[PDB]
Structures are given as structure tokens and as C-alpha cells.
Amino acid sequence: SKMRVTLGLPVGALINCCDNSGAKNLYIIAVKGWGSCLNRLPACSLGDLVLATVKKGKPDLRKKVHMAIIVRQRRAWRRAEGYFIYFEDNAGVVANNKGEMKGSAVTGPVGKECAELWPKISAAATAIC
Amino acid sequence: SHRKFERPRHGSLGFLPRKRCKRHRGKVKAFPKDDPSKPPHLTAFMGYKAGMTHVVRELDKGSKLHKKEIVEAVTVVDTPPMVCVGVVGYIETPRGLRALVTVWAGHLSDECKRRFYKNWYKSKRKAFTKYAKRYGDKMEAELTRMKNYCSVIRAICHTQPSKTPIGSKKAHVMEIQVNGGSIAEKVDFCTKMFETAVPVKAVFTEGEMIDVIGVTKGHGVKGVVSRWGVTRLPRTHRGLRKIACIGAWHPARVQFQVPRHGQKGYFHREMNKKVYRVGNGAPRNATTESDLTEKRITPMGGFPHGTVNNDFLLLKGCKKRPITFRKTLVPRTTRRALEPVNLKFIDTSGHGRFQTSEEKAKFYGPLKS
Amino acid sequence: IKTDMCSFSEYRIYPGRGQRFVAKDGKVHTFIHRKEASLFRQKIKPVKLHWTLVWRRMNKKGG
RNA sequence: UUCCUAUCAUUGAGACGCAGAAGUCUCAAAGUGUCGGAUUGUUCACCCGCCAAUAGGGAACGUGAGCUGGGUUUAGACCGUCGUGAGACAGGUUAGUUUUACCCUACUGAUGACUUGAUACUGCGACAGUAAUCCAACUUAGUACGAGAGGAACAGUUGGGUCGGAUACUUGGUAAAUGCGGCUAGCUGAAAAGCUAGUGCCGCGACGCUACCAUCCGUUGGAUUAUGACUGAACGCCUCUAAGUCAGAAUCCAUGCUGGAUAUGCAGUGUUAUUCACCGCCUCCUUUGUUUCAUGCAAUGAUACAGGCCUCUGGCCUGCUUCU
RNA sequence: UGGAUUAACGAGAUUCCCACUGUCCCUAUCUACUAUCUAGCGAAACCACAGCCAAGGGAACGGGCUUGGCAGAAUCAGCGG
RNA sequence: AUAACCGCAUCAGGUCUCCAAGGUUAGUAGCCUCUGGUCGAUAGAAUAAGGUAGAUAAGGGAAGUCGGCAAAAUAGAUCCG
RNA sequence: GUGGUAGUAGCAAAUAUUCAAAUGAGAACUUUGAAGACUGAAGUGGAGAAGGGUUCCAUGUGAACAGCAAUUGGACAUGGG
């Protein structure tokens, strides 16, 4: 039931990986709840579930299609209090087929709208926004 | 052959043709339906667009923004009081509606009278001079017609743009319908408004959906891409800001549904746009419960392209356009509509820091003469 | 009403304005304007700009 | 861009080896929608993924004075097979020019003469075009149903996608306001001021224009389709049908929205030429010239048709074939 | 009619990776010269006759023919059925 | 020889030789200048679409395409490697 | 021989002209001054060859020619070299 946020990452983007599962990278491949536009690259915002490969990381964790969630975003978006947040870097977390995160600890900041949706990623986060 | 990948259409066919309309103010079309039940009231207004600024209000919706402080963009519209002048009966025929008889007031100002001339400076200014001596010798012959016949009645009102900071003077005349009960009492409502300024608080209220008529801001002759929203062609001999294929061979004719180059903007055009604040020109307009600092809703350095020192109204065309407002065609309740409005803070600050000009003077201190 | 302040220039930010850069560690640097943000990209500091309230303060001007 | 339906999804039904969930079959349905990529010139195909669903087709196997030129199909050259050879191959391979609209129409926009006068303002709306449409979460509810696993729906609340129409408060983009500052080379005896390097470069840069890269907004009535029913014969009973009705959809027609120089359409209201100088209106009477059509070119209830009308205890209808 | 290799070299033919980008998602703004308007000057290809459509038949995809829809001066800028 | 030659012409084409200043720099590179030469190329007004050439773009970075085609990015000198 | 097309396409490379006075029937365009630019010594500078053949120089001018204009001219005419 997420509110719209500017979409900062198209399908092609290669982002950083927070958690202790051992992946350095996450290369995005598709997005959950993407409909139908001709020629539009499907893109993901803060907060939301995706699909990904790891490009470098632990060798069992490579060449598979994992689900991830997106946690920081360098593209700017408007909070309703009337200012524009934007983080330093794009980053995400490797996740199970339910929606739970795989590896428990989360480095970096996280967004408000990650912690607002997903209960588990709120707890393990160091400091939100 | 079929299309390959079945995309939706570029642009609506609802609005066509895309050509500049023959009118500078919005003509209303379709007033709301009559309840012989309510008292008699006016169902429309005219005002001039100014500029828009954001405001802070507390949401009352379980959304996640319940009890939180949301900034919102908000247009100020300058609305000095519209002076009622005439009244118009309308017979209902099988062809359509049809005007039976227009009655007018005794004494119109030169504000209204400019509308009837294209050259005011030359003329001897004769408009309603034979009528004025005829009026003193009034029109209770011709008002008796409107009581006997005539399903519909409309007050002729007009603007006061000498009070506005447009360089105008000319003043738009406008029919506004009267929707209450009893065809006699509609005329008695109109008669007692003759040479009286109708203010905005008579018509509209805080927390009300209004349907806004106007004309869009012009861009001249624009191409397919801007005009219709079309894909730009790839990096193509001849050029690439255009459609490739108009049409199939047959029909041996270009169809009207295909998008072409032409006019964009200056189109006559909304519904459900909430009024936040009715104001007064008579200080503390932008002052609220929360901030308690003395302000007028002019921002510093004017509205760019200026002042406003009249009655106005906020709410959720180009600058200096005559908007018309309308009372909504059915009174609707959508939770979103019928909302408690609460304004914390109206902004009156190129890129402004300070809310007021004395606040700037405090910061910089004793400057150099 | 309540009015948070700029990290760079120490000005006041009345609401519906500016922008909050979150850094790598997560210090939320607020700004008023693109003037401020794009000097924080270049990593020029407030102390060397004369117009800023910081250089003002340190060289016996204001207060 | 539009059209078709032999409907993949969405709407409303009916059938089941339909308990629920999930489906399969059929009817009214073309209103709305049918996607992102890897390999191949591909059409097809085959995978990875999303999704409500990734249905099939037509329009000179739509579409080259619209592009592209990867393929096929000239001239150069290579390989293999065939030929004694020149040469050949629906065998493979690489390199190889894509010309013109200013004409007519069509389509998109722009002015514009004229019609029981001029000129000005407010209007009416025939007709044409139309716009919204899908999904998810929260509660409903671990309820209905079920031996258990599993597991709905309507009303209500909150969002999202696609599409459409506006707008620039804020955020972002743009810079030749050459707006202010900084730097290189040259040139003016220097300093100061600048100028040339076709925008000399770098930073910020109002106004404007502008972006799902920003913000706002996207109506409520009638008649019916499939289908299910009511009353009820034909056929002492039964029967949704034969005569009579009723409910009923993402449908249709309105409404609303766009135009109306889309009806050579129509209405109301203002003022109508400095005083011999033209210009009206209403009578009276003469010059000419128009008419698709002068010889009484005539006549005002309102209905019904297995009934009506009244001058109404009676009378009339069976023709404007009459009565003036 | 040479077979198999091969450092250096190639405006040669292929594939992948890093860097980099408006190629792309997704378009937007700015500059000059144009197009546009005026003064002066001023061609050419092309041309049976001409130029609104639906269906019909017909040399089997009509601007003219038959049956319908219709049809209101004169003009400018574009466009590519 | 961007008007005396040849290209049908006072045609953005072609046609052998000599002399060759200052500053910046490795430099007859590019950029600015002195002597000598020239302002010859139809003008004025507006700043629409569409062009021709030239710039710049948040986030992503070849997902575009037959194909990274076009454009970006790299660039000098010294020291290390 | 003459139309329609049509006063239409078009006259947009080589950074650029401006102000005054004189001449003249007439000056955006000739000359002189003053400013402002460009060429930027492997120059649009100063000299030869091939090719051209009087284009050289002066004075004068009604046409035509110099794709606008023209008081100017490699044009036209009469002399000279």
C-alpha cells in the first residue's frame, strides 16, 4: 500500500548491497507489480520488492534470480512535509521469496518507507533516515 | 497487417478540434438544476487569476498522513465584488431556450460601459442614455412578462477591474443563473441587487468543491510531439520530431484520428477543486490561529506579473485571466470532499527566504545609505 | 511556524522548501537552495565564503 | 491510426463428475487492456521475468517523395561441390548510391465577403466528436464451507498502475538577462576599464518555458441484452409467452465535456451619422423590377375503432361525396 | 588448386568486459542561419480533361458510370493518406 | 584566380615555383597580433511548427540498435610502475 | 510561338558592418574621413610559368550585362601605353 515515490532505478541499474549474506552487488532484472507500457523500462522506487542477480559475491549466491528490497535511493523524492530527501547512494538487501530479509544485520541508513512497510528491516536498521 | 504491439492511443478525441476558442473569458455552459425548495442564490462568479503559493494544513483522513502537516500548492484568485445590473427571462421553446426580455438598471458606471465600445476615447459615450430617461419615466410592464412566462431567470452581473492591478478598466459582462424557488421571487432577488456590489462570501464558502472554467495559456503552433504527446523518432533523414506513418493506403484519405501539427493552448476548458480560504481586502488575511503574525496575502515583491488588495479566495490559465467559478452540478460527499480544512500557515515569502519585509530588515541590520 | 535551519549557511527554512541530503553515515544535511547544495558537492566549506553567516561570525561581524 | 471477432483478461449471467478455493463448458459482450528482455536480418520460434491477461487477425501479405538497409537481388573478393573451360549453385561468406512536393485533393491549424440596414454586447444549441479503465492492501475473516488441509464475497476504508486534461508554489532541467564572480592566450606604455578566441572556458545564475524528474483534477440519469422471475391461457392441470407486465450489464442513448464559418440556423438588448443633411418609422398615391408559380387557389374541439359524439328522456355515424 | 602454426602490423571480419555517455527510459530548454513577413529580383519538372466519399458492377482495387451519403465565395501556414 | 586560366557562367571545384614578421608553444600545430590586403558575398522586420549546424541535461548507464551507429569519456609534460 | 504552375521555389557557406560629409535626377551599395572587424606570412600579401590576349591606363556614358541596387565596373565608347 506504498505511496508513489520517484522511480530512481530502471531495470538495468547495478546497486550496492547492505546485508551480511556476502553479496557486494545487486543487478536489477524486474519489479513486482509492474503493469504494461510500450518501451518503458520497468523501474523501482524506495521500499519496494524487485528481482536481482548478484554480480560479485559468494559463489553459491551468484547466477540466480533472487528477490531483493530497495533501501536507499540517490534519486530525489518529495515527502509530504514539503522537502526533497535524497540519499548518497543506491542500495538494497537480499531477501526471501516471502519478503523477509535473508541476512540479519543491515549496514548504512535506510529510508522511512522501507521501515514503514517491512517490519523486520526496521528492527535491524541502525538509524532510519 | 495488424499492429504488432497493441499500445493505447496518443491523446483524447474528446477535445477536438484543438483550436483557439472565440472567447477570452470562460463561457459557463450548463448551470446546475433548480430546486424549488432552496432560497434564491447565484450559482457562479468571475475573478482574476494571480499567482500560486504553498500552504500548510493538518490532514484529517486511517491514511498514514492522518494527523500530519502537509504542504500544498494553492492558487490565489483575485475577486473584487461583481456588481449586478440586469435581469433576463428565458422562454422554454421546442427549439431550445429563448430570451424573452432583458431589463437593465438605471445607472451604469463607465466601468461597465466600456464593454460596449471598441473605441472609448473617440466616442461621445451614448450607451444607455435613451434608456435612462425611459427608466425614470420604470419597467414593471416588462418584469410582469418574466413572472407570467419564463421558466429560467439570469442576473446580468459585471466585474470591477479598475480595482484590480491589471491595466484593464473594460469589465466583463456575464449572465449568472438564479437557482431557488418561485419564479416571482427570483425576479425580486434580482431587482434588489440592481446597482449593488455582490461580494464573494454571498456565493462561496470555506470547504466547498468548485468547478473552474477558463482558457488555457497559449503556446502558438506546436508540433505533434508537444501537441499530442508522441514518440520522438530515432537519431532519420528529413527529420525526427514527427510521425512516420500517417495512414494506411485505404482509405485513400487521411483520417481525423491521426495526430497532426497545429495550435496548442488557448483552449477553453475542471471539476472538484476545494476552496480553502475566503479572504477580505478590508490586515491579517494570511494570519491564522497558529502563527499569529500580521500579514497580507501579497507576497514580497508582488505576485510576479502585481499586488492584490481586494477580496480573494484560495483553492487547491495564464496570469491575469478572467476565470469563472461554478457551484457543482450535484452536491457530493466523498470523504475527500466534505473535509475539515485546517490552515496552519500561509506562505507570503526569485527565491524568497523571509516572510515579511521587516523580517529582512532585522536580519541585515543597519545597512549603508 | 516551527522552522528548521540550514546546515551550510545557517539560514531559516520556512516549510515547503529546500532539501535534505542524507550522507553515507546518515547525517541529514538540510539546505535552503541549489546554491548551498552544489557547493556541498564541490566541497567548498562555509568558512571561506564571505557572504555566509559562519565567516561573518568568526571575523568579528554580527552579534 | 483504424477496423474485425473465431474473447486471453475485465463486466453480467447460465451448466458441472461446482463443498470451499481452483477451474473446465456456454451465452450477451470488441466498452477498456494485451507488457520488459537474451539469441536470430528474420516472419515464425525458444527461453528469462512480470502481469488482471501477456488472444488471433485485416486495412495493396497497412505503412520506403515516412525512416532504416540487417536480409534478398548487379558490378570486387573468398571457400566448398559441379564443369575440360568460360562459368554455375532455391550452398555458405564479407564489401557495396535509397532522388523530387512548390501542383490537386485529403487531413491539421489560420483569416474572410455576403443573407428583411449598420454597429455593439449577452445568448440559444441543431449537428459532429467524446473518456476513463484495471489492480492491490486493510477490515469483512482465519468467519462461511470442510473429516482435515486449506479458504472466499458484497457494503466500508486506503492506496497504486495505465490513460487523459491542466499548471510551475516547491524540487529538478535549461542560460547569449552574455546577470554577477573566477581563470588562460593575445592586444591597448602601465594601473583602471575592457575587447578578440563565431557561446574562449569554469561556478552560481532571476524571469520564462518545462519533467511521473514536480503538483493538481478526471460527472449521474433513462431504455434495454444475456439471464432469472411475475400473472396466465392454448391443453379441467402445468408453463417466463401466446395477450399482458417486472428486475437487469465494463453495453446502448442521454447528461457532462470540446467545437458550432459543423444549421450559407435562431432569439433578446444597447447605440444608430452636428441640425439643408443625409436618415428612419406610420398612413395616402404614383414609377419600375422580382416571384416555381391569383382567379372562392376557403373551412381552428379533442378522441375511440370489439366503439364514439352531442343540440343529450331523444338524435347522429355508413366521409370536405359535406357546409358556408 | 599448398596443409598446420604464428610475434609485430590493420580506416579489415566477429564476441565479451571495464570506463564513458541523451543511443534509451523520456523527453525538455537555449543559440545562429533558415522556414515566416516586407522591398527589389525571379526559375523549372509536370500538365487528356479535372480534382469529396460508400457500395455496385466493370479489363476481376473509379475523380467521371449506376444507387446512396451529400454540396455555399475568396484566401494563408503546414503536412505527406 | 571565391571575377582576367579550365570547368557553357563574375561556378564554395581544380591548376607548377619563390620570399615568409611578433606573442604563447617542442612546433611552419591551434589561438591572438604588426607590415601588406580586405569588408566583395541583396537588404529590413518578426523569432511559429519543421529543418541545418552547435550546446546542456536530475536518477539509471547500451535496457536503444542488425550492430555502441552518433556523441561522450581519455589526451600535454615530470616522476614512479 | 505561348500558357497554367507563379509573383511560387527561391536569392541563407567563407564571423561585419556603422556614422557623417562630398558627388548625383536618384545613395543600405560610389569616393573621402572617423570608428569597428576579418585575413593572421605553407596569407585573401609581394613576384614569375602554363593558359588568356589588351582585360592594363585616362576621360566620358543612352541602353543592355554585373541573378537587389549602382553616380561603380574586367561592361559600353574615344584615346594612350
Question: In sequence order, what are the beta bridge partners of B46?
Answer: B324
Q: Which of C5, C8, C14 would best serve as a mutation to test chain B binding (most B beta carbons within 10 A)?
A: C14
Tell me, yes or no, if C24 comes closer than 8 A to chain A by beta carbon.
yes
Listing DSSP states for C13-33 in one string gives: --SS--EEEE-SS--EEEESS
Q: Is A70 left (phi over 0), alpha (psi -120 to 50) or beta?
A: beta
| Technique that determined the structure | cryo-EM
- Closest-CA distance, A23 to chain B, in angstroms, reads 34
Near-strand F residues (CB closer than 7 A): A 7-15, 41, 43, 73-76, 90; B 220-226, 234-235, 237-242, 261
Here the cell at position B7 is 499500445
Give the HSE-up count for residue B277: Cα atoms under 13 Å, Cβ half-sphere: 26
The integer distance in angstroms from the CA atom of C34 to the C1' atom of D278 is: 74
Question: Collapsing DSSP states into helix, strand and coil, what is residue B223?
Answer: coil
Q: Which three cell numbers stand for residue B308?
A: 492584490
Q: Which three cell numbers stand for residue B58?
A: 493538518
Cβ count near B321 (within 10 Å): 19
- Residue count (chain C): 63
Q: Protein A112 CA to nucleic acid D115 C1', in Å? A: 73
Whether residue A127 and residue C26 make contact (CB cut-off 8 A), yes or no, is: yes
Contact predicate B77/B214, CB 8 Å? no
Partners of residue A69 on adjacent β-strands: A49, A93
Longest dimension (CA), chain A: 45
Residues C52 and C62: beta-carbon distance below 8 Å: no
In three-state form (DSSP H/G/I as H, E/B as E, the rest C), the secondary structure along chain A is CCCCCCCCECCCCEEEECCCCCCCEEEEEEECCCCCCCCCCCCECCCCEEEEECCCCCHHHCCCCEEEEEEECCCCEECCCCCEEEECCCEEEEECCCCCECCCCECCCECHHHHHHCHHHHHHECCEC
- Strand D nucleotides, any atom under 7 Å from protein beta carbons: they are 1-3, 32-37, 48-54, 56-63, 65-68, 99, 106-111, 119-126, 129-131, 135-138, 157-173, 203-220, 255-262, 265-272, 274
All three cell numbers of B185: 421571487
**Beta strand segments in chain B, E:** 44-58, 69-78, 82-84, 87-92, 97-103, 152-158, 173-177, 196-198, 209-213, 221-222, 262-263, 273-274, 312-315, 322-327, 343-346
Most A CBs within 10 Å, among B67, B71, B72, to test the A interface: B71
Closest CA to A73 of A55, A53, A47: A47
The answer for A18, left when phi > 0, alpha when psi is -120 to 50, beta otherwise, is alpha
CA B176/CA B84 separation, integer angstroms: 10
Tell me if A108 and C26 make a contact (CB, 8 A cut-off): yes
Q: Which one, of B143, B134, B64, B74, lies nearest residue B103 by Cα?
A: B143
Q: Which residues of C touch A88 (CB under 8 A)?
A: 21-24
Q: What's at C4, amino acid-wise? A: D
Residue B54 three-state SS: strand
Residue identified by cell 449568472 is B176
Assess A60–B contact: CB distance below 8 Å, yes or no.
no
Q: Which residues of B touch A3 (CB under 8 A)?
A: 64
Could you count the other beta carbons within 10 Å of the beta carbon of residue C54?
A: 16
The grid coordinates of residue B361 equal: 530588515
Answer yes or no: are the C-beta atoms of B283 and B49 closer than 8 Å: no
Q: How far is CA C53 from CA A35, A41, B21, B364, B368, in A?
A: 51, 46, 54, 11, 19
Bases along strand E below 7 A from a protein CB: 18, 23-29, 52-54, 61, 63, 77-81
